[PDB]
């Protein structure tokens, strides 16, 4: 009943330890939601974009360790706004195993420092809202330690921002999604 898409920041600003912590965060969310009606898909972004597995591909091999372990960090600039657009258009397409009438969740894991993107958040959030994609945001590193990155997290987060911004150092985001999905 729910299609959860991950968009992970692989840019040069994500240190290797945090990028590890992103990998085990995503793996734990999938692993906790196996044997349920949740399908999963992942895109890594920096200035280039790699779909490491689609909704259809997770359906054919629902092993979170096997899907996440070979993921290697891209580095480079931070094209977050373009990354948002590609997830909505490519990952949440029926051709990739996404379901039309499902609960659409995007999980963005970044440090909140878009850099070099030709697109703005103002240009991509209406597209996400049009498909009913609920957007959760996981701040990493020093994301919460500068006023610029914090106010960025609200712009990307869903309409009640207080329900949708969390940290990667805990799994409070997963509990909120689980409580959300149980309500659904």
């Amino acid at each position, epitope marked *: 009943d729910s299609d959860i898409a991950f968009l992970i920041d692989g840019s040069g600003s994500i240190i290797p330890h945090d990028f590890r912590r992103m990998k085990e965060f995503v793996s734990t969310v999938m692993e906790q939601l196996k044997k349920s009606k949740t399908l999963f898909s992942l895109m890594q972004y920096s200035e280039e974009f790699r779909i490491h597995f689609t909704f259809k591909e997770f359906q054919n091999n629902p092993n979170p360790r096997s899907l996440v372990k070979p993921i290697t960090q891209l580095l480079g600039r931070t094209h977050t706004a373009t990354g948002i657009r590609k997830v909505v258009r490519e990952l949440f397409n029926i051709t990739n195993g996404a379901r039309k009438n499902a609960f659409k969740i995007l999980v963005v894991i970044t440090d909140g420092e878009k850099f070099g993107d030709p697109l703005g958040y103002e240009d991509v959030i209406p597209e996400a809202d049009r498909e009913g994609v609920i957007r959760y945001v996981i701040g990493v590193g020093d994301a*919460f*330690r*500068s*006023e610029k990155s*914090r106010q960025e997290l609200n712009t990307i987060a869903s309409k009640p921002p207080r329900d949708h911004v969390f940290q990667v150092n*805990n799994f*409070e985001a997963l509990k909120t999604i689980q409580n959300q999905l149980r309500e659904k």
Partner: nanobody
Framework: QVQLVESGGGLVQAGGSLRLSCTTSGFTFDDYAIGWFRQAPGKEREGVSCISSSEGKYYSDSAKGRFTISSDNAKNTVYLQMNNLKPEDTAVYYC????????????????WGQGTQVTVSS
């Protein structure tokens, strides 16, 4: 029960300094990150600073370099030392608390104090 009581406000000349105090009670002090917000009337609201035992310290762009947030863990009180104050810093200063296990450094506080007036004149 839950209280967040601001004190240390008032009128100060430009270039002066003030130390605000946020004396807290009615909750376990260590479970929460405590932060400072401000809103002058007819102006937008701003985050200023926050202190968490696990996530460290946060300062807004206007606050960094001038301001210092600190915590007296024994008396459950958080202080904001504000140096080099300016007339544009005139606002009602609120202290607030957020459950620290979210790890967000006071982005969405769960409790708000009543606020105290800080005035900065030339």
């Amino acid at each position: 029960q839950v209280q967040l009581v601001e004190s240390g406000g008032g009128l100060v000349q430009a270039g002066g300094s003030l130390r605000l105090s946020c004396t807290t009670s009615g909750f376990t002090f260590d479970d929460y990150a405590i932060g400072w917000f401000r809103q002058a009337p007819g102006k937008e609201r701003e985050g200023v600073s926050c202190i968490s035992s696990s996530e460290g310290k946060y300062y807004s762009d206007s606050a960094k370099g001038r301001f210092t947030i600190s915590s007296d863990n024994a008396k459950n009180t958080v202080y904001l030392q504000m140096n080099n104050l300016k007339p544009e810093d005139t606002a009602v200063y609120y202290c607030a608390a957020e459950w620290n296990n979210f790890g967000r450094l006071c982005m969405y506080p769960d409790y708000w104090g009543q606020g105290t007036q800080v005035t900065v004149s030339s």
